[PDB]
Design a protein around this ligand. Sequence first.
Ligand SMILES: *C(=O)[C@H](CCCC)NC(=O)OC1(Cc2ccccc2)CCCC1
Length: 215
Amino acid sequence: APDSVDYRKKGYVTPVKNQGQCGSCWAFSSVGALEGQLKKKTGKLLNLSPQNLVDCVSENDGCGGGYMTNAFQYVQKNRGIDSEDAYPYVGQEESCMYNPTGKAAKCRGYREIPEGNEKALKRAVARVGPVSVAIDASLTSFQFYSKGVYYDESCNSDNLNHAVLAVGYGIQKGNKHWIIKNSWGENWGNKGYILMARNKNNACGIANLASFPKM
Ligand SMILES: *C(=O)[C@H](CCCC)NC(=O)OC1(Cc2ccccc2)CCCC1
C-alpha cells in the first residue's frame, strides 16, 4: 500500500488563481505554501494576498520574478501578510499598500529541501504540507498539458523558470507523480493542476528549489 497524499481533500488548498500578465508565479507559490501551513496550524485557511508579496517584497522583482524564500522572509519581518480580500490581486506591481488591519497569517521562517532530493521533498510534503517548488516550465509539451503524468526528457533541471506548489504525490497508471498546483488559471492543464513525474531522476528539476514556511 504505497504512500499517497492529496492535500486538496484535506482542505489545505485554495482555488486555482491566475497570474495574468505578471511574472508572479513565485508569489502564488509562496501564498500557496503559507495557506497550507495556515490551515494546518489554525484549523482553517483563507486566500492569502499574492499582490501583497508582489508590491512589498522588495528583495524580489515583482512581475519580474522572485524567490519564494524571500517571500517567507518578508512575512516574518513584516509580522504578517494580508488576505486576498484586503490586498486584492491586480496583475501588476504598484506601491506597497500593506495594512496590518487585513492580516490573515504570520510566518516565523523557512526551510529549504536539500537540492535534488526527491525523497526529502516527499517527506516534507508528507510531514509539513504543500511545498513551494520551482521547475522548467518552458517546454511546449508542458504548457499544453491536459492529463496523465507529465514527463519529457528535454525538460532542463538546470533551467528553473517557473514556481509552483506541490500539494501532494502518488501514482497513476503505474507512473509515480507529484500533484502540482499552477497559477495560470483553472483553464490551464487539469483544472489548473498537473501531475509531474516523481522519482524519474528529478524531472524538470522539481526538487532543485523546494521550500516551505515555518508557522
Ligand atoms: C514565474 O511567473 C516567474 C516568471 C518570471 C518572469 C521573468 N518565474 C520565476 O520567478 O522564476 C524563479 C526566479 C527567477 C526569475 C528569473 C530568473 C531567474 C530566477 C526561478 C524559479 C522560481 C522563481
